[PDB]
Amino acid sequence: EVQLLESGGGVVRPGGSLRLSCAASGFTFDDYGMSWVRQSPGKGLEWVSGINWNGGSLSYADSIQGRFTISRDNAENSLYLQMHSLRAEDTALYYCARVQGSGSYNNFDYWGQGTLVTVSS
Amino acid sequence: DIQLTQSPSSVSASVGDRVTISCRASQGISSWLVWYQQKPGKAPKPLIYAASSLQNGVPARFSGSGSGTDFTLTINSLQPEDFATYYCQQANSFPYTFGQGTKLEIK
Amino acid sequence: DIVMTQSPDSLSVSLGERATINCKSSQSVLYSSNNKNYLAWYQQKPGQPPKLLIYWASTRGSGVPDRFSGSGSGTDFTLTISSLQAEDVAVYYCQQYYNSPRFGGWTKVEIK
Amino acid sequence: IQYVALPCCAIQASAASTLPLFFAVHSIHFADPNHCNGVCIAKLRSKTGDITVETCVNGFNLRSFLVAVVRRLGSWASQENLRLLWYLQRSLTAYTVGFNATTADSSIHNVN
Amino acid sequence: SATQLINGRTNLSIELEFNGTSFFLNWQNLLNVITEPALTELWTSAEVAEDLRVTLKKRQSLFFPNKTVVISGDGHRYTCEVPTSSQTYNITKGFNYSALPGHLGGFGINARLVLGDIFASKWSLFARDTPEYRVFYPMNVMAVKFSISIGNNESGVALYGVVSEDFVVVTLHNRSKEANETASHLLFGLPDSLPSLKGHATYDELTFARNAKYALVAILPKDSYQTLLTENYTRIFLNMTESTPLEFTRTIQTRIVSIEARRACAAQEAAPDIFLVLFQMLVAHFLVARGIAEHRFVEVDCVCRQYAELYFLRRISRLCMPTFTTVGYNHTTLGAVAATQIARVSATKLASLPRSSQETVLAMVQLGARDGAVPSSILEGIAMVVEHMYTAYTYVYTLGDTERKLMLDIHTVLTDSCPPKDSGVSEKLLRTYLMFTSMCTNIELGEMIARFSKPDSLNIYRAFSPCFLGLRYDLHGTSGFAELLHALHLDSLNLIPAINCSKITADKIIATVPLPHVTYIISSEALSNAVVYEVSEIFLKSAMFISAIKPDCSGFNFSQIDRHIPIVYNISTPRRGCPLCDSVIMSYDESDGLQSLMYVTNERVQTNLFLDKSPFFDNNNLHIHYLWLRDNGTVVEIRGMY
Amino acid sequence: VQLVQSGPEVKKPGSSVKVSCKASGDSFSSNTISWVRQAPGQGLEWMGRLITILGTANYAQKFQGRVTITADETATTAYMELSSLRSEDTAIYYCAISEGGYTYDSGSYIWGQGTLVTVSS
């Protein structure tokens, strides 16, 4: 089947920048979009951002609208997320999905293994 | 009213050859002509509608053409099942009509 | 914009007993064009990422065991487990894709 | 030890032909807000022959032109271009919230 | 010397003196990504050495909002895609359209191809003359240009709108009689990609409302005469981003008919509301385009339905604005798809289908017949669809809610249709016009006269009637869309002169009854071709003249004049076979003129007129007089309420 | 291929016949019904057609007042009724479906086996 593996996890300083790089494989990347979903240990899940099949229409969350930039290139198998000036509570276990269809968001059918980032001192 | 004719009235085609049946009208019927193939007693088996478009299941060995007043049924290849009394029916006007029937048999 | 008030957040039923899990979106996820229910159900037991169970609040997901079955339409949904097993224990979520995705709360099954 | 001779300058209403077009500018030198008392400077360094004519010039319009070009190329953009645009936007916002009529006369720094 | 080699440097560097960091900009990047003439034009347009006081004044001239109000956003779903199956097709270069299966369009096509189909004409906005110079930087926008240029008598704000896949621009040029302009610009779209502003304005100050995706910008100078400034842009954004697509189209339609309610769909003093309505139309188009753009395989049925909705919006808007123009859109691939899809519907199949798959095919016809090229097979299909729904309607003589939408679809299909070649097809269409004018009864006319008088709750898409396709001519605050929809067929009724030789002015003509090989003209005046029939019962102030001319341009075969009313009880409820067929029956009253007309085509009809639920045989007055007509030019009066 | 019709009959001249045609497949409301008779040893002769959507029917001139083609309510059977069967009317009667236009049948044509109506004394 299809396995999604993330990379770039670690520990970051308050008010910084970091690259989240999911590397999809085993399927035609162009047709299906991807999305990001964080897993704060106290809570269970929350959606973050979404990119469509080509990368023109981009959907974003509310509380984080503006701080995040999702970039996905159809040619090379990769999905990237940048966060800017992230606060202290933006610590979770970030996941990359395999959104069904071609829209920016839909039911997610495979989920990645996941890597966690944290905002500590 | 509308009247059609078929020619030749008899063909001694043996097998695997080329046979032409002309169906000459006396007015304009656009391209609405149906070729049939009716063996004695049994029901007719329509072959081509719109004078050029094959009916379902009909083999490609049948190919019609023509429009306006001159139509034609150039059967490319022959089988004994094909052997029958054909009819060209105009499907353009009221009191529809058939041809007198091309009596095609074996030599 | 549309949130799920998932209740009850913690339920316990005996082995093999019918299990009812509810999900309530604020406004309708029903798309009047396709006449479909845009909502999905996920199972997460802690340790590995969640798994899809329901496609359109009725359609059953691929690879899912047959006991689970989606239902409901509009603002009411239910993931009814026909029989509850030892390996069934997990937490569940419900999401939408009519508007921007917005997962629900939490609901963990327990064994008496 | 070279930097720029005077970050604070004065504009005169005769620098029409002295504008060297976008393709003769070796560098553009801005100023941080409230470092020239709310006065926008650009101090373009355009070489003519062997003499680098340093030019006092409006800052808002040059910054907005830079914003225009980076946004127009934003389809094919670069990360350094991205933080350049971030600098330009933040500096322009700081200037406009610090902009008023009393600071709108750059001629008060003309060298005596 | 000139620009060709002036850039001997490797790159340009931007420097900050109070920070020990050097910024870089590789020169070739700007030259490749954006064109050289655009680069030089951009530098010249910047007004680089402009005096700071001028930029200060340009800053004070504008008007700024309070804050960039942020909302949960993401709107609703305008998108439709294939229903998770294998009906998707990738048109590579010229993939043969005869390989597209089905006759309902349930398959799917490329979304990008239709995207390029909608937006196919490049433009160079923000020219050197327009007041877009001071506000916006010059840019090349490929888009669907609109225009509502409304006058030239020193009035005439030019509302040249633009709809692109990324943004919507609209303008309110006050050309007036001088050089100065009041360029009230409205923008809507992705905040990331937008027309860059000059040094005297920023989006961070000008973004009135915000979403997760969409931002609304109001770049309008304050000093100018703009009473429109006293409105809540937040309310506009809520009404424009949170409602369902159907609700949005409904609100646009009701706003347009409200503009009809006053003289604002023709006047000038109501310019700002027209401006806002045009803006709402443009953002609706943008939303539809973005919804199609989100996916990559899109269903032809839903796309054609949305296109029909947008088409109807454009039609009604042109019905106010004769000057309304829309250029740059080329629905080519969709047109070919619809043509080859509907070339496989026979006239019987169209009538046999249920009234949920008679709308899809006719929407495909609408899309493929913007130029008047509707096939004659589909014309016969319309003929017998009207026949089927007439036979359904003749049972109870009431009209539902799917049939009226279907009738609207066929109305706009026939309106933009060129005359066909075959005379039989024209005769069949003329027969269906006769069937529609028989459909329009006194009660239906009352429904329209009472219904369109309240535009506040009106919705045309369901307020349709057969009178909007019938041959009746007596159409006689309030919306004036009756004649505005009547003219769409009256002036393009295939061969418009149904009368051929006795050309009489169409001012007092109430009815035209076009039977086969005979034409009846009912008018309060008279023709001069042959003899007429006049009612002797004219004690009141009315005139009722009927003439029967032949389509072959010949006089009467018999010169006997009636000048009287024959009273007889003959021809009661008929016998079997086919006694009365291919004929028409009048109904008139001494106090209202012409009440109704009836056409019969099959036994069910004449068995069905004599029902207690029929509009006829009612006790409104003691005296109602019926007429008997047949297709040979004779009048025999029928008396008796049996 | 082929449809289903009634059986063969031999009937006294002067009587009436009710040869019927069965729908083999989809419903008959989509198409139009044409009835064609063929005397033995002769070519076929069109008799009448019926657009069943409207119920309107039109026949040839010689069979006016004799052949009456009607459709059942359910649109699954076609009832051809030939009144006053007068001497020479023996024929292998056939029913043919045809989906097409208002006065011309273009699309489809399939024929039933045909009932053998005979006059014997």
Could you tell me which of A76, A75, A79 has the C-alpha nearest to residue A51?
A: A79
Domain assignment present for residue F96? The answer is yes
Which of B1, B49, B54, B86 to mutate to test binding with chain F, by most F CBs within 10 Å of its CB? Answer: B49
Q: Does A60 touch chain E (CB under 8 A)?
A: yes
Contact yes or no, A with E (3+ CB pairs under 8 Å)? yes
Taking alpha carbons only, the member of B84, B102, B83 closest to residue B14 is B83
CB F60 within 8 A of CB F47: yes
Contact at CB, E43 and D66, closer than 8 angstroms: no
Q: Do E39 and D78 touch (CB under 8 A)?
A: no
Interface residue E193 vs chain A (CB under 8 A)? no
Q: Name the β-bridge partners of F71.
A: F78
In the sheet with F4-5, reading across from the earlier edge strand, the strands are F4-5, F20-22, F77-82, F67-71
Report yes or no on D16 lying in a domain: no
Topology at the third CATH level for domain B5-104: Immunoglobulin-like (2.60.40)
Cβ atoms A94, A34 nearer than 8 A? no
Per the structure, the count of domains in chain D is 1
Contacts of A43 in chain C (CB under 8 A): 106
Rounded to whole angstroms, the Cα distance separating E215 from E219 reads: 13
Burial E394-431 (b: 16+ CB within 10 A, else e): beebebeeebbebbbbbbbbbbbbeebeeeebbbbbbb
**F51 chain-E contacts, CB cut-off 8 A:** 348, 384
The alpha carbon of residue D51 is apart from the nearest alpha carbon of chain E, in Å, by 16
Contacts with B84 from chain F: Cβ below 8 Å:
none
Nearest to E47 among D61, D84, D105 (CB): D61
E626 in A contact zone (CB under 8 Å): no
Collect all residues of chain A within an 8 Å Cβ-Cβ radius of residue E297: 102
Q: CA E462, CA E459: separation in Å to the nearest integer?
A: 6
DSSP E372: B
DSSP codes of every residue in B1-42: ----EEE-SEE---SSS-EEEEEE-SS--TT-EEE--B-SSS
Which positions in chain D touch E68 (Cβ < 8 Å)? none
The full length of chain E comes to 642
- Contact A53/E295, CB-based, under 8 Å? yes
DSSP E138: P
Q: D–C contact (≥3 CB pairs within 8 Å)? A: no
CA distance A51 to A37: 13
Contact assignment for E52 to D57 by CB distance below 8 Å: no
- Residues 6 or more apart in contact with residue E383 via CB below 8 angstroms: E347, E428, E429, E431, E432, F102
Determine whether the interchain pair F30/E391 forms a contact, defined as Cβ–Cβ distance below 8 Å: no
Q: Does E50 touch chain D (CB under 8 A)?
A: yes
Binding partners of F (≥3 Cβ pairs within 8 A)? B, E
Cβ of E81 under 8 Å from any chain A Cβ? Answer: yes
Q: Hey, which residues 186-225 in chain E have their CB within 8 Å of chain D?
A: 192-194, 196-200, 202, 204-205
* Interchain proximity F104–B32, CB inside 8 Å: yes
Residues of D in contact with E12 (CB under 8 A): 25-28
Q: Name which of E103, E348, E422 to mutate to probe chain F: the one with the most chain F Cβ atoms within 10 A of its Cβ.
A: E348
Question: Does E352 reach chain F within 8 Å, measured CB to CB?
Answer: yes
How close is the nearest chain F Cα to the Cα of E583, in Å?
15
Cβ of residue E31 closer than 8 Å to a chain D Cβ: no
Residues in C closer than 8 angstroms to E73, CB to CB, are 1, 100
Q: Among partner residues E346, E424, E602, which is closest to F100 by beta-carbon distance?
A: E346
Question: By C-alpha distance, which of B41, B43, B79, B44 is closest to B60?
Answer: B79
Distance of alpha carbon E169 from alpha carbon E274, whole angstroms: 15
* E299 half-sphere exposure, CB direction, 13 A CA radius: 19
Mutate: best of E345, E346, E435, partner F, most F CBs <10 A: E346
Domains, chain A, ranges and CATH? Answer: 10-112 (2.60.40.10)
Beta-strand ranges (E) seen in E276-391 are 297-299, 325-327
Residue that has been written with the tokens 């030198």 in this structure: D29
- Residue span of the structural domain in which D91 resides: 22-98
Neighbours of chain B (3+ CB pairs under 8 A): F
> Is F108 in CB contact (< 8 Å) with chain B?
yes
Q: Does E16 touch chain D (CB under 8 A)?
A: yes
The CATH number covering residue F10 comes to 2.60.40.10
Considering the domain boundaries, does residue F119 fall inside one? no
Please indicate the experimental technique that yielded this structure: cryo-EM
Residues, chain B, total? 107
Burial degree of B67 (CB within 10 A; 0-12, 13-18, 19+): middle
Residue F111 forms part of a structural domain? no
Q: Which two tokens stand for residue E637?
A: 């009066």
How many domains does one find in chain F? 1
Backbone angles phi, psi at E208, to 5 degrees: -70, -45
Integer Cα distance of C61 and C54 in angstroms: 5
Looking at chain C, the residues that come just before a C–N gap of over 2.5 A are none
Assess contact for B61 and B81: CB atoms under 8 A: no
In a domain, C83, yes or no: yes
All residues of chain C having their beta carbon less than 8 Å from the beta carbon of residue A113 are: 49
Let me know if residue F88 belongs to a domain: yes
List, in order, residues 6 or more apart from E468 with CB less than 8 Å away. E407, E408, E411, E485, E486, E489
Contact F54 E384 (CB under 8 A): yes
Show which subunits contact E, needing at least 3 CB pairs below 8 angstroms.
Answer: A, C, D, F
Instruction: Identify all chain E residues contacting A59, using CB atoms and an 8 Å cutoff.
Output: 74, 212-213
Q: Chain centroid to CA C33: how far?
A: 24
Return the closest-CA partner of residue E137 out of D16, D73, B44: D73
Q: Could you tell me which of E275, E182, E292, E203 has the C-alpha nearest to residue E236? A: E275
Residue E628, token pair as written in the block: 């008997």
Residue F47 lies in a domain: yes
Q: Which residue type is seen at E368?
A: G
Look-up of token digits 């150039």:
B74
Burial class (CB in 10 A: 0-12, 13-18, 19+), C103: buried
* Cβ–Cβ gap E79/A54 under 8 Å: no
| E91, E109 contact by CB (below 8 A) | yes
DSSP β-ladder status, D44-48 and D25-30: antiparallel
Task: For residue A46, give the nearest of C42, C44, C103 by CB distance.
Answer: C103
Beta strands at B70-75 and B19-24: parallel, antiparallel or unpaired: antiparallel
C2 in any annotated domain: no
Q: State whether residue E619 is helix, strand or coil.
A: coil
Tokens at E138, concatenated: 């010059």
Cβ-contact E550, E502 below 8 angstroms:
no
CB nearest C101 (choices: A95, A105, A114) = A105
Contact E428 F102 (CB under 8 A): yes
C100 with E246: Cβ contact below 8 A: no
Q: How far apart are CA D91 and CA D68, in angstroms?
A: 15
3-class secondary structure, F40: coil
Q: Locate all alpha helices (DSSP H) within E463-547, ordered by sequence.
A: 481-490
- Chain F residues close to E422, C-beta within 8 Å: none
Q: What is the resolution of this structure in A?
A: 3.5
The distance of E459 to chain D (nearest Cα, Å) reads: 43
Distance CA D97, CA F91 (A): 101
Question: Which of A65, A71, A105, A109 to probe the E interface (max E CBs under 10 A)?
Answer: A65
Q: Is there a domain that residue F34 lies in? A: yes
Q: Strand pairing partners for E16?
A: D30
Domain membership of residue C79 as a residue range:
10-110
- Residue among D55, D63, D71 whose CB faces E199 most closely: D63
Task: Count the neighbouring beta carbons within 10 Å of the beta carbon of residue D6.
Answer: 14
Do E430 and E379 form a contact (C-beta atoms < 8 A)? no
DSSP 8-class letter at E227: G
> Measured between CB atoms, does E344 come within 8 Å of chain F?
no
Q: Which of D56, D52, D53 is nearest to D30 (CA)?
A: D56
DSSP D22-35: GGGEEEEEE--TTS
Q: Do F30 and E380 touch (CB under 8 A)?
A: no
What total number of domains does chain C contain? Answer: 1
**In 3D, which of F83, F104, F86 has the Cα closest to residue F19?**
F83
Q: How far is CA D48 from the centre of its chain?
A: 19
Angle at E207 between CA D28 and CA E246, to 5 degrees: 140
User: Which chain C positions have a beta carbon within 8 Å of A112's beta carbon?
Assistant: 49
